[PDB]
Amino acid sequence: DLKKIESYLDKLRIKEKDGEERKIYAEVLDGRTLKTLYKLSAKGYITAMGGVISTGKEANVFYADGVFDGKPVAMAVKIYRIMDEYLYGDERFDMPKEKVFIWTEKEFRNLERAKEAGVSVPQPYTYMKNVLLMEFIGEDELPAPTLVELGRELKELDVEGIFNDVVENVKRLYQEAELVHADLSEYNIMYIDKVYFIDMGQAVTLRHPMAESYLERDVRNIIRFFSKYGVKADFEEMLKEVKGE
Ligand SMILES: Nc1ncnc2c1ncn2[C@@H]1O[C@H](COP(=O)(O)OP(=O)(O)O)[C@@H](O)[C@H]1O
Ligand SMILES: [Mn+2]
């Protein structure tokens, strides 16, 4: 498959001179994946694949220029490598490769649902097989930092305001989307002017058996993280705020 990869990297214009990008692409992505990107390119969603944003155990994220709804947009292209407790029990999904495709769709559906409810996530564009295209959060091809990446710089912001933004978003996600993120933490919240939630393939509906326990986990993480910055919050008060009690 090595020859196919290099062949698609060539068709995608991912050049040697583009830093370490080509070698990262060729290692983290396979042929069938590149075929999909090229087909998304041919369909007109992707104009130019850009730099590598994140390489992970489950997913790889890249920058691209593309077009959505008639206009040029900056995109995060998230690609799942070709889970269980988070699928089973979520009856929306009628239950190794087909499963990565379902998770991809799940994240997409979760973004759309969260988006429609007024939660701050990246506007979802499209998905195909293991590739998801969404709004790039950041500027000049530089992603907005997650809250862990902000770090001590959080001390020079209105941390209490950021905390309340986070809470408002969880409240909307629960009350209006009827979802629970289930991996909400400082690693999965970005910030530029406002918070954005990301990473939502595992999000579940309020019908999921574990939804409440997931939510309480999410709430504790947020309380724990923000306590390091002098935000005083109570588990009981935050939980009842989210759930509308
Ligand atoms: N829409 C986006 N815009 C800009 N950067 C993004 C976007 N989505 C994800 N990223 C970057 O990629 C990183 C990993 O994405 P994430 O969805 O958290 O997957 P994982 O936890 O599997 O690596 C995020 O921490 C962020 O740094
Ligand atoms: Mn993540």
3-state secondary structure 38-65: HHHHHCCCEEEEEEEEEECCCEEEEEEE
Q: How many whole angstroms separate alpha carbon 210 and alpha carbon 216?
A: 10
Q: How many whole angstroms separate alpha carbon 103 and alpha carbon 200?
A: 9
- From which experimental method does this structure derive? X-ray
What is the best residue among 28, 52, 61, 189 to mutate for testing ligand 1's pocket, by most ligand atoms within 8 Å of CB? Answer: 61
Residue whose structure tokens are 């509308």: 244
Q: What angle do CA 126, 132, 138 make, to 5 degrees?
A: 95
Residue whose structure tokens are 């020859």: 3
199 among known catalytic residues = yes
DSSP 189: E
Which of 186, 59, 61, 203 is CA-nearest to residue 135? 61
DSSP 146: B
At residue 180, the 3 state secondary structure works out as strand
At residue 230, the 3 state secondary structure works out as coil
Q: How many whole angstroms separate alpha carbon 115 and alpha carbon 101?
A: 21
Q: What is the residue with the minimal CA distance to atom 22 of ligand 1?
A: 59
Span from the CA of 107 to the centroid of ligand 2 (angstroms): 12
State the CB neighbour count (10 A cutoff) for residue 137: 20
Query: What are the tokens at 224?
Result: 């724990």
Q: What angle do CA 65, 165, 135 make, to 5 degrees?
A: 10
State the CB neighbour count (10 A cutoff) for residue 128: 17
Span from the CA of 62 to the centroid of ligand 1 (angstroms): 9
State the CB neighbour count (10 A cutoff) for residue 209: 12
Report the nearest atom of ligand 1 relative to the CA of 56.
23
Q: How many whole angstroms separate alpha carbon 80 and alpha carbon 78?
A: 7
Report the nearest atom of ligand 1 relative to the CA of 198.
17
State the CB neighbour count (10 A cutoff) for residue 176: 14
Distance of CA 142 to the CA centre of its chain: 16
Question: What phi and psi, each to the nearest 5 degrees, are found at residue 191?
Answer: -145, 115
Distances (CA, A) of 150 to 57, 119, 131, 194, 223: 23, 21, 28, 13, 17
Which of 54, 47, 29, 204 is CA-nearest to residue 131? 29
Question: What phi and psi, each to the nearest 5 degrees, are found at residue 76?
Answer: -95, 125
DSSP 214: H
218 among known catalytic residues = no
Domains of the chain: total: 1
Instruction: Report H helices in the chain.
Output: 2-11, 21-28, 31-42, 97-116, 147-150, 159-175, 211-227, 235-243
Strand 71-80 and strand 124-128: the pairing is unpaired
Resolution attained, angstroms: 1.9
Strand-pairing partners, residue 190, are: 146, 196
User: For residues 176 and 117, is the Cβ–Cβ distance under 8 A?
Assistant: yes
At residue 238, the 3 state secondary structure works out as helix
Which of 122, 117, 110, 93 is CA-nearest to residue 200? 110
Strand-pairing partners, residue 85, are: none
Which of 25, 67, 60 is CA-nearest to residue 43? 67
Sheet holding 71-80, edge to edge: 46-55, 59-68, 71-80, 131-135, 124-128
Report the nearest atom of ligand 1 relative to the CA of 59.
22
Cβ(169) to ligand 1 under 6 A?
no
Q: How many whole angstroms separate alpha carbon 201 and alpha carbon 31?
A: 23
Its domain, for residue 178, covers 1-245
Phi-psi region of 206 (alpha: psi -120 to 50; beta: other; left: phi over 0): alpha
User: For residues 139 and 163, is the Cβ–Cβ distance under 8 A?
Assistant: no
Q: How many whole angstroms separate alpha carbon 67 and alpha carbon 142?
A: 19
